[PDB]
Symmetry: C7
């Protein structure tokens, strides 16, 4: 014998975008009037390239950061549960131990030989699954919920800290020594969809309020940390090296909810 | 206690085709009157072949591009969520380290020998899944949603940038040196269904409008980028090489929705 | 508050068979009166054998072709969505790089030796799934929807274009050199069920019509392309070779739908 | 606003058995009065053994055959869809290409050697799934639906056509040379459940009739084809060889359906 | 507009146990009044051990046998469908063919050698799944339904017919030569749960009766076949050998169903 | 048209705990008034350690035992079905047979050699799944249902009967020769959760009673069998050996059900 | 015919956080008035780093501990079932035994040799799944339910007890010898999400109370055990070693439930 009052609003600002889509609950048997909100937005990657014959520079997003802040004026409302949350990672382990025995019979020009062979074997394999981007929940309190989406490594197997005395960091290197700066960066074909184009997020969260509920304020804060990766032609081959955050683009989105009118709005 | 008003319309123009099938929602408990639209269309590949005894030319689609544009006249309506969206790619990693020891006993003509052997092993395997066509979401704002469907590589393992000093790019090469131009291209048997015949798309999107809702306009824009791949007989063997976009076929489809009459129409 | 009016009809003609089973929708909240049709028919393979002591000839279906054509007299009705549709194919890739080091100690008749060994390893595996028959959607417009079901290759790993200087095409060869013509063809045991007996199809499609809807016409067209594969005894062993379409059996089935009476009929 | 009239009947005759369990549909919105029937019966294998010290003979079923025939007196009723139907078989393919390089350092009695090694690797694996009995749909028309269930091969990997100069066909051979005729046949432990005891079938089928519907007749025809496999002791070892159909047991079951009374009966 | 009349009864007799739990159906639209019965009972294994210093004897169940017999007095009622039923077994097959080429360079005391190597590879693997106990349906008629649950082989890979000149049958042998008779049998730890303790069954079956339905009789017959496996100390090592059925415990359970009163009872 | 009367009670006694949560069924169409009970309790492991510099002793649970006893005073009530029950274990078998042929060409100081090589391969692999604790149903009658949960073996691969002349039983040994008694036992990190902390059970069971149903009594009996495993420092290395049951902790819990009042209670 | 009264409350205290979200049940057919509570909270990891050129110190959580305590004043209420609970761990075992035979033919300078080779193979592999954090249920009584979440080992394969004479414990070591103290710790990229940021828990539990139910008290107690892991530069390479609990942060949260008012509150 409860009623549900849906509502939603969205804002863009510079092509970022946040969709705040909420559902209010006025259950009579529940002492506290609760609501739950889904954040189904989008945020660009802005993968940009600058190059020449002997030099390249690809700007790309190393890590995204989305924080949702609640703010009750009377300070009764509190973000209860916040999805997504962290999970214990699993790894497949397998050990083996074998033994092989045998012998042989040989002959070469009226001289017959023969032999015996014994061997022992051991191997410890360890499989597991690694995502191209690790999504860790950084903070989660009564009025804050932060999430980071940070780059792990490429399908090729290169990370931000990779280093080779000759080629430097081989991250995003199409060719060790062939094509020029702008054409030497990895094509969107093989890249992770997160870097190729805008990606993320999907964050849900329930907030419990009293029957008094008049007004509350949620605030969505996107922050994209852009690393600059450069290619320097060292005469014989390409030598890549990765710098970091020259500028970190940031956009906040203020959402206000009215509980008496059962509506959600921007600003 | 809400009502749902379905509606749909379709247009073809030159054998492309777009199916706009929407469902309106007039929920009283929802302050904003929202609708959601599914785009279940079709678009041809137009795989064409031209050849001779010593020359071939297969035109094929390298990448498709579908952009949906909303346009509110009062500018209240805003495309909230847009499916499909990007996902973090997963890769299976597995490392192993073993050690094998043993020995032997031999003899050859009244002379007995024997030996010992020790060995160590290490291997770092990295499995993952690669689609024949990567589907990346390029843009997604308050009035635009672009998606690209670009070619990754063949089951054989060849990409657009593949090169061999002798055979050139072996993409779509049936035989290195046997049959003639027109007959040397890969048969539809082994090809990806996307190139063999028309394929794509499936894009959903919700747009939130106020109670005032009178008129809005959605616009579906298909664009197919056709690469020309040619085969040149270099006396002893075939030498393939891949050019690009000579002409890029494009088709727009204007859909208009009336919210007061609860109907969707073309133009 | 909508009503659904089911209806169905079937025809055989020469043992082919088409089942047109439709469901009409008279939704008041939908401006256009829509219907959806499932095509759950059957079509024979007609695998026939002719042989002798030193000669064989198995006729078999290389590719099936099913096209559904809509035809509105006023030209308001248009086939909206058509199932099945094409899907981006996925392939499993896995690369590995290892290194193994060790040594040994030996002795043979008062002379002790010893050694060291180092080795490096690399392997690039590529797994994927190939169907015995690729089902590609060829065309899909406002009044046409064509589908092809073409033969890929045998479980043994032979295709239509396979060739060996000695045995020729080993497709459907039970024995290289043992049994005679009629008995040398592959038994239905190991064959694909599509060739062993009749198979296919399953094609659904929705067509949107206005409230005016009086009459429409759907037309199912089956076409089976039969390749003739022959075995010629070349004295020492069998030499198989594959010709093509001597005759291509074809059957059309005219279905007419009345929307005012809510019924479907043949002719 | 439709009504469903269930009904069922079963008959045995010699321990075979057929269960005809139907459901009639009197939908007012459907112009044609349709029914659907499930055939959930059973049929024995009759695996029999006859043997001695130096001779054996196991009779077993090579292939089953079930055909369902409809017969309308006015000839209005027609079996629309018939389950099961054939499916395109899938096979997993995987190709790999590697390269391993290295070297060594050796010494034996004041004489130090050393070396280099290079190697290349290629492998084309092809996995797939093979059932012990292939179920192919042979025929399917307006008044007939035939299905065959034929033996493929054993888990050991032997088929009907297997041959070895010494042991002959090793199908169903427990021991090459040890135990006597009757005791030399494979125990029901390792055998396929289809041969060990009676097995099959499960066949569904819908038939569409007009409102006039008075009477129709379905007919279930089982036929079991029994191959005789014999073991002849050739002094040193067992030599098996497989003959075929000495007698093929057959049983028909006439079912009649009354649509005016909404009942199904035998004969 | 039908009614369902549940009912159930159970009996034990010597710790065996049978649960007959039925559900009657009085559907007006169905001409025949049908019922369906589930048999969810239990039956002990009675794994018993007798031993000494140099002798052992473990009694264990080789195969279970459950037969359900129906008996209509007027002979109208007939067991229609009977679960479980047999299924076609599937096996995974995989074939591979490779080729590896290379060479080497060597030197030992002012004498440089070198070489070439070529190799070819082929392998035919066959995987499949084997249950510890094969459940085959032996008979199924109008008034009988028999099922056998027979022992296949151990996880170690030993069957009833295994034989070794020295150790004899190694079935259920904990140690080849260490501990004494009673302590030499395999502990319940590694054994199959079916032999460790009582196990089975689960058999369902539908019987169709006319409206006249007054009385029917079902009869559940359990039979456990116990093989005696003995261990004889042959001085140096253990020599196991397996006899068979000394006594086969059997228990019948008479259930009678009243359809007029809608109840099921024992005796 | 039936009614369901839920009820529950729980008791602890010494930190063991049993949750008896039942649901009664008063169906008018069912002649017998039936109930079903779920047993979702908990029982401690009591893993205790006692040690010194040269001696250790870890007490741990080898096997748990839970028996549920019903007791009707008039003796009408009988435990019908009892979950969990035993299942036939499955094992994956795979056999392979290959053959590799090749040759070589060599030369060392104006003396050219060459060779041929042939090889054959066979391998019989057998995979399966083994739980750390086998759960076998020991007994199941009209008034008793016993279940055992016994230890199989460690992930490392050691069982209760493992023995090594030097280290003895390596079960639960952290180090062969390094740390002292108390610190030498395996940390809860790698241990099975059943031994690390309390675990089990989950047992359901239905009991059928007549309409007369006044009172019945269920009785839950836990029994934990504790094996004492000791470590004795044999000067150079650790020598572990496993004793058994010094004391077996036991706890009974009497539950009584009133069917007239539709309630369940303790004692 | 029952009623459900939801309710919830949350508290933070120092950025920890506990969400107590309960659902009361007032079923008339149930003698005892029961409730069930879900604990969907969050708790920080507080991974802190302190370092220099030749020294590092990363504080991290080794194990979490969550205990829920119930407290009835009249002492009628008792926590019945408590989720999560422990599960028997499964391990995949596989054994293999092969044999390979062959021979060779060689020749080197007018001297032809030849040989035979025989070999035997055995291998016992054991796969299983190990979580980065083992979640064991420590205690569960009538008024207490404790759960531990303890660290197992890294994806690399290092545990708390790992030791190497040279590098010490390689846990969390980015480089053996390259970068300095603060920069030498493992980046959040590769770390387990539990340590990178706050994680856990999710614990449900049902408590059965009588109709009298006036007040009860639940108490959530978080305790995080922080191990200090340090890196000491031993001139040539890094030597890591792991200390333990310097301080163990702890936070309790008192929740009180009123059953007469059907509400849950903090303190």
């Amino acid at each position: 014998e409860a009623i549900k009052y849906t509502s939603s609003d969205t804002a863009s600002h510079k092509g970022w975008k946040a969709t705040l889509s909420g559902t209010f609950i006025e259950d009579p048997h529940s002492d506290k009037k609760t609501a739950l909100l889904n954040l189904e937005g989008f945020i660009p990657s802005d993968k940009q390239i600058f190059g020449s014959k002997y030099y390249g520079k690809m700007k790309w997003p190393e890590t995204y950061r989305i924080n949702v802040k609640s703010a009750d004026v009377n300070n009764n409302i509190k973000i209860a549960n916040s999805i997504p949350k962290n999970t214990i990672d699993k790894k497949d382990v397998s050990n083996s131990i074998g033994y092989s025995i045998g012998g042989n019979i040989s002959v070469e020009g009226k001289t017959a030989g023969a032999g015996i062979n014994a061997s022992y074997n051991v191997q410890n394999t360890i499989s597991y699954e690694q995502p191209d981007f690790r999504t860790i929940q950084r903070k989660d309190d009564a009025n804050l919920a932060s999430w980071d989406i940070k780059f792990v490594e490429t399908k090729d197997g290169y990370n931000i800290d990779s280093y080779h005395a000759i080629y430097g960091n081989q991250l995003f290197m199409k060719s060790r020594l062939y094509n020029n700066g702008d054409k030497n960066f990895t094509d969107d074909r093989d890249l992770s969809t997160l870097i190729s184009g805008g990606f993320s997020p999907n964050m849900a969260l329930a907030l419990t309020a009293p029957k008094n509920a008049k007004e509350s304020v949620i605030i969505v804060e996107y922050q994209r940390f852009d690393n600059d990766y450069i290619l320097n032609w060292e005469t014989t081959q390409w030598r890549g090296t990765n710098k970091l955050s020259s500028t970190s683009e940031y956009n906040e989105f203020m959402f206000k909810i009215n509980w008496q009118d059962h509506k959600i709005e921007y600003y």
